[PDB]
Amino acid sequence: SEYAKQLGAKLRAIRTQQGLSLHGVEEKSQGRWKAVVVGSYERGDRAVTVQRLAELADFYGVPVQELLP
Hints:
69 residues; dna binding protein; BldD DNA binding domain
């Protein structure tokens, strides 16, 4: 729970850092990443899979390790 919490704190830190809001992600990604889904990752309310995390890190353009708590 705490881990999920802190993981989502970084998922948010990277997203906002490149100036994108949650709606921004859904739009730029042509709908592959739904704001709803990404938000729930950022609040630790929904658990991302390691696979899925790997793709996000790619979409954002950062080393996937960096998103780990």
